[PDB]
Amino acid sequence: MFLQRPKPYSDESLESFFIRVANKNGYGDVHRFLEATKRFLQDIDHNGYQTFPTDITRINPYSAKNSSSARTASFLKLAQLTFNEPPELLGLAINRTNMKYSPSTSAVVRGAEVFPRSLLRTHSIPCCPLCLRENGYASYLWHFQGYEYCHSHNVPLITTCSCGKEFDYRVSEAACTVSNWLAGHESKPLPNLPKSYRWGLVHWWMGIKDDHFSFVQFFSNWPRSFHSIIEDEVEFNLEHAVVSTSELRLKDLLGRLFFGSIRLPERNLQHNIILGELLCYLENRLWQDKGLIANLKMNALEATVMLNCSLDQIASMVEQRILKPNDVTDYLFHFGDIFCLWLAEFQSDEFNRSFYVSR
Amino acid sequence: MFLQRPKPYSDESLESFFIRVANKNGYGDVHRFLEATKRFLQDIDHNGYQTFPTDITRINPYSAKNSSSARTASFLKLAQLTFNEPPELLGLAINRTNMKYSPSTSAVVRGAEVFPRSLLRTHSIPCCPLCLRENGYASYLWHFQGYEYCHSHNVPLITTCSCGKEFDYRVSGLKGICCKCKEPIEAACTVSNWLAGHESKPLPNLPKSYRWGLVHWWMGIKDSEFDHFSFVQFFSNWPRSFHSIIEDEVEFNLEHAVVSTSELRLKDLLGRLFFGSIRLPERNLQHNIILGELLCYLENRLWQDKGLIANLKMNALEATVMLNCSLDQIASMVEQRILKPNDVTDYLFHFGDIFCLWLAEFQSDEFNRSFYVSRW
């Protein structure tokens, strides 16, 4: 009862929140208060105390297969009746979600922001002193945020940083722009897209390349780079057609570019201008030849990623004679007819047409 | 066919554009242009030559029962061939959507704005004739209910004549004068002047695609037309009188509950407050704060009165309605034990169990709960 004066500010990965309430009043590590919490959960009016963790790690609410729904309920009354002025506690929890990306990477929600994959480091991370402490470490690329040359791996003697071995993970120029971009600033050479799309497209550059100087060369010519990468890869795989010479089926014509940039992770056309510009170069040139873009072979399974269906509306659309039959697994229909009924009967307010060119 | 384009306007309706391009190309009436356009689509052999309408009120893509794909594809061919400079016509078109409104109302989309279906006028549309007399082009706000007064001249929309023959601009042309007789034709003013995007009065401001859902929410609760006087009065005492009506209605069906104080469904404890404010048009509760404060009441009032709110019984398909999932994904929650139970229709789950479930498994970047941490 009555944890005196919850102080803190934003930008924290919730692990030092228990450390900052540990350094008050005189207490060793966090095993006592962490037992006295789960003892208080074992106390009055509670049902899910058995799975609240024991160690330095695992306070994370995705570390168990099925105590995810028990950890947030544990975290519900862990702020209200144990703090004077109950602080911003909920929302700091790095949860899991139902979302994915196109390269089949697991999405993960912190409070509004999505990391590329729930794999990144989880162990043996660098750390810098004189804050309390950070939000952004235990990740791939978040190093300095203004003050540089701070890696701090502890080859010399014990207790360099003055905290008390709580978080303290230590064992015995283009990088400054991207570090300020992932921490959140103005970043004048970059088009100011939010952190769900910031980390959402770092893996999109990591997925197609299989590198901070190779990072910023794609962003120094940002109104030219995506238009140049789409025009030199469309001439690839044209002499390798499958039927006779043309009318190429699925997976062979832009099967990597189109199936790698859709819903990463949210379907907004205001910020994710990749989806609007790939729609531009593919459909500023609608009918070039007989069977070049529109007159191709498409399937209804890869059509519901744009149409937003669950294979239940197709039994009421093709029998109502909107999409003319020219069947679930065959490359039957065409790209030009499926996209146009999407524009005619499957629009939205933010996932719509009136956000790309012309501005 | 070579056509000269008129001056573009962002607030011009779709039907009036075919009328004002029939005026500058020498037509007596506008239906003669629709017959010549169908002949032009027949010559170029584009797929819309079977179902191109020669009638003015069915030129919209939602009027076609099965040829909306043939309608907008012909809109793409006319935008790039018969004009010297391509105009913006897809923003002028009115296209359907799969996103529904509460409880079962469909919706339609024009440009970057989603309109309701129950407010769509299936009858004759009124007119402000002095806008047709000075400017000559009509507005797109006349196609849907709620927009009663003009936001530019503060004058009411005149529906019919003094004799009985109503005028509509879709037939005779937009000079504004009838066919048969052919004669010259604060709260309501409040709800007029923050529809076209005007950000000046303390009535609440939304991206006005979401605002029509706020108009549609007012008609579903009151079960009448979109009232204007109490609409200003309800938002003048915002958000103080909102939570009182929430409190007086959860007191209502609990004082007059039929079964008991427990073993109840969430009907007759949240009957119309929960099922009538879900999808307007999306649950992004920073925008539609009618769900951001409803799900604020669902957070701060969980575990009082010996779990009176945490013993509301639910079935399986309410998770498909609320939490945006399917019935097959619920069976994955049972086999790998993330959801713990205690068939689709049978009532088996619990409320404090399901509220802490979607903060851990069913929270997207758009559908967050952190968006109102500074409101309560």
Q: How many CA atoms lie within 13 A of B78 on its CB side?
A: 28
Q: Please identify among residues 225-244 of chain B the ones whose CB lies closer than 8 Å to any CB of chain A.
A: none
Total length of chain B: 376
- According to DSSP, residue A357 is labeled S
Q: Are strands B312-313 and B264-265 parallel, antiparallel or unpaired?
A: parallel
What resolution does the deposited structure have, in angstroms? 3.2
Contacts of B76 in chain A (CB under 8 A): 286, 340
Give the one of B66, B73, B361 whose C-beta lies nearest to A98's C-beta: B361
Helix, strand, coil percentages for chain A (3-state, nearest 5): 25, 5, 70
Task: Tell me the C-alpha distance between A346 and B51, whole Å.
Answer: 20
Q: SS3 of B153, please?
A: coil
Q: Is residue A108 within a helix (H) or strand (E), and if so which, with residue range?
A: strand A108-109
Distance CA A10, CA A184 (A): 13
CA atoms within 13 A on the CB side of A312: 7
- Name residues 115-174 of chain B within 8 A of A (Cβ): none
**A189: cis peptide before it, omega within 30°?**
no
| Experimental determination approach used | cryo-EM
Contacting B residues, span 78-117, partner chain A, CB-CB under 8 Å: 80, 88, 90-91, 95-99, 109, 111-114
Residues of A in contact with B373 (CB under 8 A): 88, 90-91
Residues B218 and B208: their CA atoms lie apart, in Å, by 15
d(CA A126, CA A139): 10
CA separation for the pair A18, A34 (Å, rounded):
9
Q: Do B360 and A96 touch (CB under 8 A)?
A: yes
Exposed/middle/buried for A265, CB within 10 Å: 0-12, 13-18, 19+?
buried
Identity (one letter) of the amino acid at B316? Answer: A
Which amino acid does the sequence have at A230? I
- Give the DSSP per-residue string, A133-169: --SS-SSSS---TTS-S------S-S--SSS-SSS--
Q: Rounded to the nearest 5°, which phi and psi values hold at A3?
A: -75, 110
For residue B15, the SS3 value is: helix
Amino acid at A212: H
What is the DSSP secondary-structure string of B312-374? EEB-SHHHHHHSS--HHHHHHHHHTTSS-----SS--B-HHHHHTTTTTTS--SSS-SGGGTT
What does the alpha-carbon distance between residue B215 and residue A53 come to, in Å, rounded to a whole number? 48
Closest C-alpha among B71, B90, B72, B92 to residue B20: B92
Report the helix count and the strand count for chain B, using DSSP H and E: 13, 5
For residues A88 and A25, give the distance between their C-alpha atoms in angstroms, rounded to a whole number: 21
Q: How far is A148 from chain B (nearest CA, A)?
A: 31
Closest by CA position to A97, among listed A72, A123, A122, A75: A72
